[PDB]
Amino acid sequence: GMIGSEKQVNWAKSIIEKEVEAWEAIGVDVREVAAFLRSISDARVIIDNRNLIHFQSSGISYSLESSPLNSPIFLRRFSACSVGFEEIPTALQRIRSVYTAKLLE
Amino acid sequence: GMIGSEKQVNWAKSIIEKEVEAWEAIGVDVREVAAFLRSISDARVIIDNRNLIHFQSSGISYSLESSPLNSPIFLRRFSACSVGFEEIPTALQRIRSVYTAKLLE
Amino acid sequence: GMIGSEKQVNWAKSIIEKEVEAWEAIGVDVREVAAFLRSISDARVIIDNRNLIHFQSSGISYSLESSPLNSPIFLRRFSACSVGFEEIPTALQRIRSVYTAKLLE
Amino acid sequence: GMIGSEKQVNWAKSIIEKEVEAWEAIGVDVREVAAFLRSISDARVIIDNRNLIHFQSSGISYSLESSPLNSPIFLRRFSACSVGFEEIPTALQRIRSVYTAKLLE
Amino acid sequence: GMIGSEKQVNWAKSIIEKEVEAWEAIGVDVREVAAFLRSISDARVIIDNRNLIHFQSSGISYSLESSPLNSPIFLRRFSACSVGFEEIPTALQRIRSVYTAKLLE
Amino acid sequence: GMIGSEKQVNWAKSIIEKEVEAWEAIGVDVREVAAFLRSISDARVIIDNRNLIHFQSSGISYSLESSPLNSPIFLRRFSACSVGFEEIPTALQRIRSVYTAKLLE
Known part of the structure; x- marks a missing residue:
């Protein structure tokens, strides 16, 4: 599983679940x-980037548009300890397109 | 299966099959x-949008370029009664790119 | 400048003024x-395309996104009787991006 | 031109000159x-955004890629007090493309 | 398997393996x-296009940017004797984005 | 303006006129x-790149799509001896979009 002390793994898992909850509160497929x-x-890596990756539930559109998950350079920091980073900028483009259309419709 | 009276389901299914036939007559993967x-x-929903979604076999290039399936805002109307709408604008970009190259080659 | 009979010119000029006013009611640079x-x-050409180009004030975002001015193929019909058609799809991308951001901000 | 108290104007002008110098140190047309x-x-507006817009010389590529000047939503805050904001995301795409090519060549 | 004489199949297979090796030497998912x-x-088809498709291990960035696998028109020549050509321009965009970010990071 | 020996300048000027004529034979704004x-x-620089840049009249669409003028990396070689290279990839996207639409219309 995740590498790190028991304290770090506990902290990192709570960071990830908090972010996953923020993304899932948008209301489109994420x-x-x-x-x-x-x-x-x-x-x-999760702990060190907990603030940089944070998704603000106030202002979903700007959080999507400004998220560092849009940036291939930023995502390099996860290249050795993640799965699927090569596709994440593409995924954010789709999610932004879907959520924007839902709001505008 | 599809929701609606027997008459509506019969009509909607014939609309969808007519459209699928139009898309399949292009000659590239659709x-x-x-x-x-x-x-x-x-x-x-199929019946109400039968004319808006219609793909004209005369002028395939323009039918592809102008199709409302290009539009995430339009596709919102299928968000609760379809599968895969989030990817359909991307699919049309690819199909347009493939068919255009076939014609130009 | 404008070629056509006196009645056609008068009708076409009024169509264009109506369309310009619809675009200028959006509230971003058009x-x-x-x-x-x-x-x-x-x-x-204006008269024959008066309905195809018409910009509907009732749903601005969808009018922008679905406008045939997005389509290089559609714009070919103005190629011999207008200035700047090559840049209009780019212009619509920009306007859509600006107006979308204004609504979402 | 610049509205504000005399101290705010002086501070804002110095912030802008600092940012311009950071952008002009890249070595491509900005x-x-x-x-x-x-x-x-x-x-x-300049003062309140002095840190959000700040361009860091230490990592030029990431500064370009992550700059909030990429974001139409972020730029809305300058819409009533600047010239050319509608073109700035396009400008950043171009500058990123030019500077990236220069580094990779 | 591959169509052609035993000599042509042997030659074509060595061409493909040489190219696959060049792509795999980049160091990102290909x-x-x-x-x-x-x-x-x-x-x-492989033999006739052995020079046109060739990926130069000197100058990976330019080899990626200039590869004819970027071009849907070029890829039409493989439309009847390959699998997955419709997605290859998209794949090159992703690979270019990933490798560029790795170098710039 | 043009630097080089008298023979190089004469040869380079004729290369450029030949290329301009090839681009202007397409029939869209270039x-x-x-x-x-x-x-x-x-x-x-013109002489050394006379074959790499050459525009072939026999297949206009593919010449446009494969032109090294699409490539920011390739264009770096003109960065110190030309005007407007930063906009040329954008220009080629536009020209490709206009000429493609003209053929397909």
């Missing part, structure tokens, strides 16, 4: 992003 | 679009 | 689209 | 971004 | 491209 | 590409 976050297997 | 159309599970 | 519409120099 | 920054006419 | 190349089932 | 070609100010 399964690909939730699976990516749950695949991150290094507690120290 | 399986993703055919599966999406066949997943629409509300006869009343 | 000067490039307004200039393109006012550059169309063939009354018959 | 004239459009420099012009946009120098067009912002509200000292309070 | 499985989709390797599978596409290994799906090409006509030795004569 | 003024921006023509201006860029005529802005190249180093005879040796």
Whole structure:
């Protein structure tokens, strides 16, 4: 499973679940992003990036548009301890497109 | 299966099959679009949109370019009675790219 | 400038002014689209396309996203009687991006 | 031009000059971004956003890719006190494409 | 298996394996491209295009950016003797995005 | 303007005129590409790239789609001896979109 002390693994898992909850509160399919976050297997990387990745439930549109998960350069930091990072910028484009259309419809 | 009276289901199914036939007459892979159309599970939504979704076999290039299946806002109307709508704009981009290259080659 | 009979020219000019007013009611910069519409120099082409190009005030986002001005193929019909048609799909991407951001902000 | 108290204007002007210098240290054409920054006419808006917009010289590629100037939603806050904000996301795509090619060549 | 004489099949297979090796030396996931190349089932098409498809291990960034696998028109020549060509331009966009970010990070 | 020996300048100027004529034979607006070609100010750079840039009249669509003028990395070689190279990939997208629509219409 996730690498790190028992304290770090406990902390990292609560960070990931909090983020997955934020993404799932949007109301459109985010399964690909939730699976990516749950695949991150290094507690120290999760903890160090807990604030940088944070998704703000106030202002969903801006949170989606400005998320560092949009950035391939940012996602390199997960390249050795995650699954599916190569597709995550594409996934955010789709999610932004779907959520934007839901709001505008 | 599809929701609606027996008359509406019969009518909706003939609409969908007519559209699937139009898409399949293009001559490039359209399986993703055919599966999406066949997943629409509300006869009343199919009937109401039978003219808006219609694919004209005269002028395939323009039919592809102008199809409302290109539009995430339009596709919201299928969000609760279909499968795979989030990917359909992407699918049309690919199909347009493939068919255009076939014609130009 | 505008070619056509006196009645066609008068009708076409009024169609264009109506369309420009619809685009300018959005509330974001549409000067490039307004200039393109006012550059169309063939009354018959304007008249024949008066319904295909019509911009509906009732649903601005969908009017923008579904407008045939998004389509290079559609715009070919103005190629011999307008200025700036090559840039209009780009202009619509920009306007859609600006107006979408304004609504979501 | 710039609205605000004398101290706010002086602080805002120095913030903008600092940001322009950071962008101009990249070594590719950034004239459009420099012009946009120098067009912002509200000292309070500059001051309040001085950290959100700040361009870090230490990692140019990531600064470009993560800049909030990429975001139409973020730029809405300059819509009433600047010139050219509608084109700035496009400008950043171009600059990113040019600077990336220069580094990789 | 692959169509052609025993000599042509031997030659074509060595061409494909040499290309797959070049793509795999990049150091990012290229499985989709390797599978596409290994799906090409006509030795004569592989042999005729051995130089056009060649990936230069000197200058990986330019080889990726300039590869004819980016071009749907070029890929039409494999439409009847390959699997997955419709997705290959998309795959190159992703690979370019991933490798570029790895280098820039 | 153009640097080089008298023979190199004469050869380079004739190469550029040949290329401009090839681009202008397409029949859509290529003024921006023509201006860029005529802005190249180093005879040796033109001569060394005369075959890499050459535009073939026999297959216009593929010449457009495969042109190295699509590539920011390739264009870096003109960065110190031309005007407008940063916009040329965008220009080629536009020209490809216009010419494609003209053929398909």
